What we know:
Chain B: It is found in: Nucleus; Chromosome, Centromere. Chain B: This is Regulatory protein SIR1. Chain B: Interacts (via OIR domain) with ORC1 (via BAH domain). Interacts with SIR4. Interacts with CAC1. Chain B: Residues 1-125 are annotated as: ORC interacting region (OIR). Chain A: It is found in: Nucleus. The complex is a heterodimer. Chain A is of the alpha+beta class. Chain A is built from five helices and ten strands, in the order E-E-E-E-E-E-H-H-E-E-H-E-E-H-H. Chain A has one domain (1-195): Bromo adjacent homology (BAH) domain (SH3 type barrels, Roll), CATH 2.30.30.490. In chain A, the strands form two sheets. Chain A has a six-stranded mixed beta barrel with strand order 4-5-6-7-9-8. Chain B has one domain. In chain B, 14% of the residues lie in helices and 32% in strands. Chain B is built from three helices and nine strands, in the order E-E-E-E-H-H-E-H-E-E-E-E. In chain B, the strands form two sheets. A five-stranded mixed beta sheet of chain B has the order 5-9-8-6-7, with no helix packed on it. In chain B, strands 1-2-3-4 form a four-stranded antiparallel beta sheet.
Amino acid sequence: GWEIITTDEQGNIIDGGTEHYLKRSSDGIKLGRGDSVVMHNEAAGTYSVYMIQELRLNTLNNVVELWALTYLRWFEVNPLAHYRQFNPDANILNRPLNYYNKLFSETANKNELYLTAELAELQLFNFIRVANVMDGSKWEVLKGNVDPERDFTVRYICEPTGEKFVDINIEDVKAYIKKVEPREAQEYLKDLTLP
Amino acid sequence: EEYVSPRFLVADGFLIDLAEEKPINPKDPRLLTLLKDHQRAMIDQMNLVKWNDFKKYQDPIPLKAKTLFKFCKQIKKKFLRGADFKLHTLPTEANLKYEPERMTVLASCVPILLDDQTVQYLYDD
């Protein structure tokens, strides 16, 4: 129940002979490069969020591959790595490893996501809803009026293992992702977390 | 109370999944995907409630489990409340036996999906 829409740089192209996005027949949800989606994740037993990175039309197939960049949710952070980074005198620790689990779980904003450079193929039948992913400032605006099921904030890209946090402007990332070549885009975001 | 990872809380002999805000069978195959070695080790040394002991209880399950009810999403379900305030399952048909002291009540509880697709309910007495 999803349609494919192809356009030049602006107007649509007909079927009879270039950007791709998906449109839902039901309401008119548009999904394309830069949009974030909440996805059912059967293996994790909880939902995941991604930013769409490429709608690869697979002439290999006559089928559509929806590739996206994976967000981390709070519980996928490495709480020791996070603490040690943001407390420099906390690479010399003395606490139990489980204290760091309690501390992170208890103080983290559960709707703060962390970008990663890791791609996933997403299947449309697992799509739950569009994510509203805003930067740290836009998130101060909304504080007492956020919907914990749609509304998310991002401050960092980091490694898929939940460490090495680097400040990013998420709104700048969306615009970058919808401009440059996917392969170039992913490889650049991959370099953002390396010494 | 032990936070064996940022997602998983052990408290009151229950494993609590803090993303889903709900208890997990410690024997849930899904943990083979989610737990690290050291975290599985912790749980095995931890002495948890066996979810199988629930299987043929016909009424809901009363608990002293403060942390569990604090961190878990609850639904309201229709039950019969006795004179002692224990909840009992509603018979989905006429039961006939005079019980004037048992009354229909909408009570807060925590649903758990059992091994065999049977649903149980935990509540604090």
